Every structure is written in structure tokens, then in C-alpha cells.
């Protein structure tokens, strides 16, 4: 009867309903065939388009310049947590700020070609458990 309790009850009920919402994937959903709203054309789905392209950022030329000479190997990628991008040419590695681009970091530590790089979480209990992330870099000889 009291409005205040009443309102609370309504929200709670609705909240419950929101939580109950059906599971995303079920075999039954598209057992016959998938419903698709599929246009070949960009912005073909006018109102509905799930994604839009907000912006394009080119690799900074300053960064590119230190990638100019690469005999052996190239590779690049984005680190999801960092919101930074990395470029590997031969031995050297660059990390550049997604948002900035001017800001870039360079590894001079590695002597040899860099086979692979990866971002990983630290162990539960080591001296560096505190650090947010670890950067693993593998070259032919060593893993740093």
C-alpha cells in the first residue's frame, strides 16, 4: 500500500526479470537455418547497424621510421589490457599508445630476433605479484 515499498517491489521484480533473460545460445534457436538480417551493403542496415567506424589512426611515422629496416621478420599486434599496440621488426620492439601515438616505448634489451610477444598476468605469489601485467618476449635464444 505504501508507495515507497510498492515502488521498491516493482523495481525488484523488474530486476529479476532482467536477470532471467534467456540464454544467448541454444541449438534450438537455429536448428532450422539461421534468422539473418544480412546486408552486403556499409550502413545497409540503417537503424540497426551494430557497429560503426568511429576513427582511424595511422601508425605514426615516427614509429614506422624505426621499422624501416627489417631484413628477417615483422609482426604487430594490439595488447588488449594496455590499449597499446606493438610492432616487432627483427630484434626490436615498439609499444605505442593507442590514444596518443606520440608516446611510444622501445625495447633495447633484446639482442636477438623476437619470435613472439605476449601479455600475461602475474602469478599469485611471486615478488612481482603486484604488477598489473607482464610482458613475455621470446627470441630464438631466450625468453624474457
Amino acid at each position: 500500500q505504501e508507495a515507497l515499498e510498492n515502488a521498491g517491489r516493482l523495481i525488484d521484480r523488474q530486476l529479476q526479470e532482467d536477470r532471467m533473460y534467456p540464454d544467448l545460445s541454444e541449438l534450438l534457436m537455429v536448428s532450422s537455418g539461421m534468422d539473418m538480417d544480412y546486408p552486403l551493403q556499409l550502413l545497409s542496415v540503417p537503424n540497426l547497424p551494430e557497429i560503426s567506424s568511429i576513427r582511424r589512426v595511422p601508425l605514426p611515422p615516427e614509429l614506422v621510421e624505426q621499422f624501416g629496416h627489417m631484413q628477417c621478420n615483422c609482426m604487430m599486434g594490439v595488447f588488449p589490457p594496455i590499449s597499446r599496440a606493438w610492432l616487432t621488426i627483427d630484434s626490436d620492439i615498439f609499444m605505442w599508445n593507442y590514444e596518443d601515438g606520440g608516446d611510444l616505448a622501445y625495447f633495447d634489451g633484446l639482442s636477438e630476433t623476437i619470435l613472439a610477444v605476449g601479455l600475461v598476468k602475474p602469478k599469485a605469489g611471486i615478488f612481482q605479484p603486484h604488477v598489473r601485467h607482464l610482458l613475455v618476449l621470446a627470441t630464438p635464444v631466450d625468453i624474457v
Binding site: 546486408p39 551493403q41 550502413l43 545497409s44 540503417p46 537503424n47 540497426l48 547497424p49 560503426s52
Partner: protein
């Protein structure tokens, strides 16, 4: 007739408010009243004009702002001015120095106290002393009047005492002591007898006999007012329990009874009495009568308004409404001017009035529908080009939404598009826009000059928005471009250029030019947006037309007639598949054959 007379007048007045609004905006010191006084000089206005001078004296004539004190001052100064002028012109030049006393002696002596001198004054050494004291008093020169009495050679000398303290104080000479004594003497000795001026001085200074009027020497209507004003006692009137109190209210009522406008004759002068008396409301109402010149009443009100009066449309006094109703005359024709007048409403600073102003403007925009003028216009990037109101500023977005929605009710498309542009609802604009262009596309032919309308409107927006940081949905824009492409196809369809039309239509990628892919055109058909789905009818038949005319069987080498033939075939299969989902004109057939 035509009466350029008023319109010219309307414009002159409008001009003045306009300058006034500029000053308020620019923090200037433009006087409203001087401005009218300047114009008013010309004639009939010789009343209205005096009224303005009265108000102007009031300029910053607060200085505190005591009703009777200011009225008194105006009357007193006016008399003084009158006196100075008379002196300032020949004679002697008066023999002596220009002192105020002598100026008045001159008025009394030279002016009409004597045709060739004489009668019932008390005179010593050729001078009516009492008349002098009275007039000096009239002028507002109380101190001098007092001095004259001091020097007087008289024998009512107790009165002399009562003059000096009347003067010493705020002029409401209230001794807890003698005032009573003075009154008794007046009744017994003075009241039944004496020299008119002497009586005046006693009565006026003393407030001796509240039944009011001075026998012989009330010679002017203003003399009449001044006397009455002198008599009222505002302060500490309530205190003291005699009923010898005379109030402004009482004075005001007498002026009403019958005395009437007729009674205050010079009806001309009545106006002034109302202002002096503090009947502002009545004053506007009275100005409200002849030709009241609704215009004059409005502006006067504006002037009282600047003065900060109005402290709580023939007979409708509220300032907002007085202004609003005035606007009714011109608003359709001169919406700009209306805005200028509505803006004055704010002059009464405070909420309520502010909202009244806002509502009035809102009301003006609505139903006048002068959106461009009032609200603004065309971006060319560079936001809005400000409308008149915007120059004034603020709540303008909410009004736009309100107007725009209304436009939607009425279905006044164009207005809606215009309104939404100002709203800066870019997506909404294009969508309404697509609808407008979309219909008018389907129909029957013979139109589309190359210069103005919905198509032209279409071109404006696309060029305009799309380049710049386009906020619209991709989908929305896409249909937009398609509609434009179809339109360019129209321009070139007819006006010759058969070959060009096919090329463009094919580019649309709507109609199967290739193989029997006509059916894929079916699959992609239902998917089509509502706007295009509607347009297809003409796309077909445009194709079978150009296709027909271009493929007019030629005269007498490579002639591939086969294509532009296969195209018709695929198109017909297409048309064959969707005739039901089309208006119902497979009279493609007529054009198809020959």
C-alpha cells in the same frame, strides 16, 4: 485613405524601443523619456509631452521616491521656471540682482497682480508681503519665504514661530506642542476675515482647516494640485489621534469623484493630474482613451515601467499583457518588432514576469510561424545564423522542439525539417527528408525544374551535412544518396540523353541488367527499405523507355541490339515477379512492344 501617418508613427516608436533594447544589451545610458520628449514636441502631444517631462523629472527621482514630495517638486519647479522666464526678458533687466526673491517680487509686481495696481493686499513699502511668502513657498523656496516673514513687520508673530520649525524639520512640522494653539487662532481670528494670501499661508503651513480650498488665490489647476499636495500629511499621520489627517488616498479619491477628466479642463491636463496624484494605473487607462493612442498608452506604461512602477486592451493594465496585446496589432506583419516589445517585459525584473515574457515569445513563434525570422536559419556549417530572438537568447532549443512536434501534427513538412535542423537533430532531418523526397519521386512525369524544391532541398542537406562530421546513420544516408541518384536519373531522363539514363540506372544496382538474376532482385526487394520499395515502379518503365527509344530499329558494322534487349527481358521477368507488390501498372507491356 491609407494613414501613412500612423505606421510612420508606429515605426518611429518602434525605432525608439529598438534603440532602448540596444542600450540595455550594451549597458548604455539612453534615456527613453528624453527621446519621446524630443518627438512629442510637435503637437496634441502638448499634454502627452508635459506628461513625459513629469516622468523624466522622476528619472532617478526616487533621491528616495515619495509620492507627494516629488509631485510637489515638479509643480514647484515648474512655477519657478515660469518665474525665471518672465524675469528673463526685458524690464528694469530688473533693477536689482537676480536673486530668487527679487524674481518673485517681479512676478508679483509685473505679472498680473496689477493691471494698474491695487486691491486688498497688505502692503508695506510697495510690496505684498503675504503674497510674496505664498509665491516663494509656491516656488519651493521655503527658506526665503521664512526670511521674508522674519523681516516682515507684522503682528501675528506667534505664527512666525510656527513657520520656523515647519521649515527646520522635514516640513512636516510636528511639535508635540503648539500646533493646537495655532489652529485655534486660525479658527477664531484668521478664518473669518483676512487677506487671501495670509490665509493661504496659515492654512497651508498649518494644515489648519482640512475642509479644503483657498478662496481668492487659486489661479491655476496646478496651483490647485500643489495646494492639495501641501495639505496631505503622510508621515506619522497614523500617530496622533486627531482626525485632521488628509491622505494621498483621500486626495486621489477626490480627483476621481466628479472630479472627473472633464473637471480637470485644459480634458488635456487630466493626464498630468493622474501622474502627479499617483494614479498610474488610471493614468495609463486614461491615456488609453482618445486617439488614446493605444500606442501612447503602451509607451507611457513602458516609461513608468523603466521607473520601476507597476508595483501591483483598453482596460488591461498588467505590463506583460499591455505589451502583448499591443503586439497583436502588428505581430503577423512585423514579427521582429513584436519581439522587441515582448522583450521589455523583462524590464520588470523578477520571476513570473520572466516566464510571462518567455511564454509570450513562445506564443509568438507558434501560430505566427515566422520560424526563420524568429528562430534562425541555414547552417553552412557555422551553426545557426541567429534569429531575432536568439540575439536576445536562451530557451530556444525547447521552443524549437515544441514547434517542430506541432509541425508534425499539422504535417507541415519543410517547417519540420527546418525546425529539426535548428534542433540539430541531423538524423531526424535526413529521415524526414528521405520521406519527402521519396514520395514525389513515385508519381507521374513532367516536373523538376533544375532550381528549387524538395529535390533541391535534398541536394542542400547532403552537400551540407555529409562532408562535415556527419552524425547521421549510415543507413539513413545511404537511402538519401539513392534518392539523389534516382533524381539525377530523372533530370537526364527526357531532355534526351537516353544512353546516359541506362548507365545511371544500372549503377543503382537495384534492377537486374545481367542475366536471369532477376530473381535475386526478388530476394532483394522485400528487404528494401520502405522508401525505395515504393520508387521501383518508375525505375522500371524508365528502363523500358530509354531501352525502347534508344533501340529504335535503326536504318541501314557492329550493332549489338542484343544487349539493351536482354535488359528489357530481365526487367520484365522482374516486373512479372513483383506486380502484386507494385501499384498495378504492368503497362510496361505497352512500351515493351510496338
Amino acid at each position: 485613405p491609407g494613414r501613412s501617418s500612423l505606421d510612420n508613427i508606429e515605426m518611429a516608436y518602434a525605432r525608439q524601443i529598438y534603440i532602448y533594447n540596444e542600450k540595455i544589451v550594451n549597458g548604455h545610458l539612453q534615456p527613453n523619456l528624453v527621446d519621446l520628449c524630443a518627438s512629442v514636441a510637435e503637437l496634441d502631444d502638448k499634454s502627452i509631452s508635459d506628461m513625459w517631462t513629469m516622468v523624466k523629472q522622476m528619472t532617478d527621482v526616487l533621491v528616495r521616491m515619495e509620492f507627494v514630495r516629488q509631485a510637489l517638486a515638479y509643480l514647484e519647479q515648474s512655477y519657478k521656471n515660469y518665474t525665471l522666464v518672465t524675469v528673463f526678458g526685458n524690464l528694469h533687466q530688473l533693477g536689482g540682482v537676480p536673486g530668487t526673491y527679487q524674481l518673485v517680487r517681479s512676478f508679483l509686481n509685473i505679472k498680473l497682480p496689477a493691471p494698474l495696481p491695487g486691491l486688498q493686499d497688505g502692503e508695506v513699502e510697495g510690496h505684498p508681503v503675504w503674497a510674496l511668502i505664498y509665491y516663494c513657498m509656491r516656488c519651493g523656496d521655503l527658506l526665503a519665504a521664512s526670511q521674508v516673514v522674519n523681516r516682515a513687520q507684522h503682528q501675528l508673530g506667534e505664527f512666525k514661530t510656527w513657520f520656523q520649525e515647519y521649515m527646520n524639520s522635514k516640513d512636516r512640522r510636528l511639535s508635540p506642542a503648539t500646533e493646537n494653539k495655532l489652529r485655534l487662532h486660525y479658527r477664531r481670528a484668521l478664518r473669518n476675515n483676512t487677506d487671501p494670501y495670509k490665509r493661504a499661508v496659515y492654512c497651508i503651513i498649518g494644515r489648519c482647516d482640512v475642509t479644503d480650498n483657498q478662496s481668492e488665490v487659486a489661479d491655476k489647476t496646478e496651483d490647485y494640485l500643489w495646494l492639495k499636495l501641501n495639505q496631505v500629511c503622510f508621515d506619522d499621520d497614523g500617530t496622533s489621534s486627531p482626525q485632521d489627517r488628509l491622505t494621498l488616498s483621500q486626495f486621489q479619491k477626490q480627483l476621481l469623484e466628479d472630479y472627473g477628466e472633464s473637471h480637470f479642463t485644459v480634458p488635456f491636463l487630466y493626464f498630468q493630474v493622474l501622474f502627479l496624484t499617483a494614479q498610474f494605473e488610471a493614468a495609463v487607462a486614461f491615456l488609453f482613451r482618445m486617439e488614446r493612442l493605444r500606442c501612447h498608452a503602451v509607451h507611457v506604461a513602458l516609461v513608468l515601467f523603466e521607473l520601476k512602477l507597476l508595483l501591483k486592451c483598453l482596460r488591461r493594465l498588467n505590463f506583460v499583457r499591455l505589451l502583448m496585446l499591443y503586439t497583436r496589432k502588428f505581430e503577423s506583419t512585423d514579427p521582429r518588432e513584436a519581439l522587441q516589445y515582448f522583450y521589455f517585459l523583462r524590464d520588470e525584473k523578477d520571476s513570473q514576469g520572466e516566464n510571462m515574457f518567455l511564454r509570450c515569445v513562445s506564443e509568438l513563434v507558434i501560430e505566427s510561424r515566422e520560424f526563420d525570422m524568429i528562430l534562425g536559419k541555414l547552417e553552412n556549417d557555422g551553426s545557426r545564423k541567429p534569429g531575432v530572438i536568439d540575439k536576445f537568447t536562451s530557451d530556444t532549443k525547447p521552443i524549437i522542439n515544441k514547434v517542430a512536434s506541432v509541425a508534425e501534427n499539422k504535417g507541415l513538412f519543410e517547417e519540420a525539417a527546418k525546425l529539426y535542423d535548428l534542433a540539430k537533430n541531423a538524423d531526424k532531418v535526413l529521415e524526414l527528408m528521405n520521406k519527402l523526397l521519396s514520395p514525389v519521386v513515385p508519381q507521374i512525369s513532367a516536373p523538376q525544374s533544375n532550381k528549387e524544391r524538395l529535390k533541391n532541398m535534398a541536394l542542400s542537406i547532403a552537400e551540407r551535412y555529409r562532408a562535415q562530421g556527419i552524425s547521421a546513420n549510415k543507413f539513413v544516408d545511404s537511402t538519401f544518396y539513392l534518392l539523389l541518384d534516382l533524381i539525377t536519373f530523372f533530370d537526364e531522363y527526357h531532355s534526351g540523353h537516353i544512353d546516359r539514363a541506362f548507365d545511371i540506372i544500372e549503377r543503382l544496382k537495384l534492377v537486374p541488367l545481367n542475366q536471369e538474376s532477376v530473381e535475386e532482385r526478388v530476394a532483394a526487394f522485400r528487404n528494401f527499405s520502405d522508401e525505395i520499395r515504393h520508387n521501383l515502379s518508375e525505375v522500371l518503365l524508365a528502363t523500358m523507355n530509354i531501352l525502347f527509344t534508344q533501340f529504335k530499329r535503326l536504318k541501314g558494322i557492329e550493332d549489338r541490339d542484343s544487349q539493351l534487349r536482354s535488359q528489357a527481358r530481365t526487367l520484365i521477368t522482374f516486373a512479372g515477379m513483383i506486380p502484386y507488390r507494385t501499384s498495378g501498372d504492368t503497362n510496361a507491356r505497352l512500351v515493351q512492344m510496338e
